A paper describes a structure:
Two parallel peptides, Hu64 and As64, from the O and Asia I serotypes, respectively, were both crystallized with SLA-2*HB01. The two peptides Hu64 and As64 are derived from residues 64–72 of the immunodominant antigen VP1 protein of the FMDV O and Asia 1 serotypes, respectively. The overall structure of SLA-2*HB01 retains the characteristics of MHC I molecules common in other mammals. Among these, the α1 and α2 domains form a typical peptide-binding groove, which contains two α-helices and eight β-sheets, and the Hu64 and As64 peptides are embedded in the groove.
The structures of the swine MHC I molecule SLA-2*HB01 carrying FMDV-derived immunogenic peptides (Hu64) were determined to a resolution of 2.5 Å. The crystal was estimated to contain two SLA-2*HB01–Hu64–sβ2m molecules in the asymmetric unit. Interestingly, it was found that Hu64 displayed two different electron density states, indicating that there might be two conformations in the refolding of Hu64-binding SLA-2*HB01 molecules. The first conformation (CM1) of Hu64 is tighter than that of the second conformation of Hu64 (CM2) in terms of electron density. In addition, it seems that, according to the isotropic B factors, the conformation of residues from P6 to P9 in CM2 is more flexible than that of CM1. Further analysis showed that conformations 1 (CM1) and 2 (CM2) of the SLA-2*HB01–Hu64–sβ2m crystals exist in different folding states, mainly related to P5 residues (Thr), i.e., the P5 (Thr) in CM1, but not CM2, serves as an anchor amino acid. In conformation 1 (CM1), the P5-Thr formed a hydrogen bond with the Glu 152 in the side chain of the peptide-binding groove, whereas this did not occur in conformation 2 (CM2). By way of analogy to chemistry, the CM1 adopts a ‘chair’ conformation, indicating a more stable conformation, whereas CM2 resembles a ‘boat’ conformation, indicating an unstable conformation. Just as predicted above, Hu64-CM2 could form a quite different conformation with TCR compared to Hu64-CM1 and As64. As a result of this change, Hu64 is no longer able to come into contact with TCR α in Hu64-CM2.
Numbering used by the authors:
A (entry chain B): 1 to 98
B (entry chain C): 1 to 9
C (entry chain A): 1 to 275
């Protein structure tokens, strides 16, 4: 039983250029628990922390991977996820409106 | 607080 | 709703190295408060919420001891289920376990539970009566009979009806101002143009706790849940949650659509509209 990760990329508070915030990559609904998550600023890995591995009622796993950041009209952010269920890595760009 | 059992499968 | 203390175990074998990895996360309702990782340097049970930090070393030594005893058992348990299913010794496999207690209005056990899964599939479960087990297949029946032979259920039951609900009460006190008060969502609406005949309105609900909310779009009192884009509730990163609901309306009809937010932090349900 293998399940692919669902990815959601967002900020903790409404993105407002110049004001310090939190870039979140919420990965969930996946199985087995071995997973690889990198946060990207213009295509480059940063330095990030994650919440502890947890699971839902349906036994699928979920963790939040996040870092502190300051948004602007210039910088592009995204989340890169790798998992046994994926052909290649799944990159999901950050869209402040969704 | 955790449950203290160590019963094998 | 009624409060709950829960623990999640995850045991993953690593036939590669000769070992396995073991995770515990503790929850009161939807708030994580403790964690354990066998792969952590000199691994112990750790606080994961500001309100549990006030516990003495006597508390942490006990939970740490229990974590490692359990982690050691699961090292063998993985091998056992592998043998139960006549599986090769090459692949990484997983056992998961959830158990906990719900608090009743009288301060006694409302309901207690335990359920286990192997490789993502339901394996064994403790029955509501807390004196019997239900097995999903043959392998689990071997396991079921072992636990009957040593009366595992009675240890579980004495825990659930006693220690579990007692500590739950304490945790609810320790963290009463985050656990026990509802946090209302910070709500606003945004407008996003598409094409000539498409404008997207997005109703936001941010920083709310608990996780349960209702978001609906109505058109002049008429439900639009059919063509409404609604996202999975997501963590804010601070123990609160986010959600949004959107739908595409015509560029003229912004005022004809209203977003309705219902959350227990709210005094009266909200009707929002784009400005």
């Amino acid at each position: 039983v293998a399940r692919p990760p669902k990815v959601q990329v967002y900020s903790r508070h409404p993105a407002e250029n110049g004001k310090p915030n939190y870039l979140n990559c919420y990965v969930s609904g996946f199985h087995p628990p071995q997973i690889e998550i990198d946060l990207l600023k213009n295509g480059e890995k940063m330095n990030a922390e994650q919440s502890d591995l947890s699971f839902s009622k349906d036994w699928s796993f979920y963790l939040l991977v996040h870092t502190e950041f300051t948004p602007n009209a210039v910088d592009q952010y995204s989340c890169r996820v790798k998992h046994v269920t994926l052909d290649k890595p799944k990159i999901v760009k950050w869209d402040r409106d969704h | 607080a955790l449950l203290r059992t160590a019963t094998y499968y | 709703g009624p409060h709950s203390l829960s623990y999640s175990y995850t045991a993953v074998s690593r036939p590669d190295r000769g070992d396995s990895r073991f995770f515990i996360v503790g929850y009161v309702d939807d708030t994580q408060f403790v964690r354990f990782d066998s792969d952590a340097p000199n691994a112990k049970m750790e606080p994961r919420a500001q309100w549990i930090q006030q516990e003495g070393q006597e508390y942490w030594d006990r939970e740490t001891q229990i974590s490692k005893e359990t982690a050691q058992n699961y090292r063998v348990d993985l091998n056992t289920l592998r043998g139960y299913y006549n599986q090769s010794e090459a692949g990484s496999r997983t056992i998961q376990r959830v158990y906990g207690c719900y608090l009743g209005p009288d301060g006694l056990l409302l309901r207690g539970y335990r359920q286990d899964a192997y490789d993502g599939a339901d394996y064994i479960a403790l029955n509501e009566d807390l004196r019997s087990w239900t097995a999903a297949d043959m392998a689990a029946q071997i396991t079921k009979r072992k636990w009957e032979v040593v009366n595992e259920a009675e240890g579980e039951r004495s825990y659930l009806q006693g220690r579990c609900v007692e500590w739950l009460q304490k945790y609810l006190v320790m963290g009463k101002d985050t656990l026990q008060r509802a946090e209302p969502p910070k709500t606003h609406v945004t407008r996003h143009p598409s094409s000539d005949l498409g404008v997207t309105l997005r109703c936001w609900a941010l920083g709310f706790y608990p996780k349960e909310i209702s978001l609906s779009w109505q058109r002049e009192g008429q439900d639009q849940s059919q063509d409404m884009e609604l996202v999975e509730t997501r963590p804010s990163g601070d123990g609160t949650f986010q959600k949004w609901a959107a739908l595409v309306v015509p560029p003229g009809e912004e005022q004809s659509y209203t977003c309705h937010v219902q959350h227990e932090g709210l005094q009266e349900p909200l009707t929002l509209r784009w400005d």
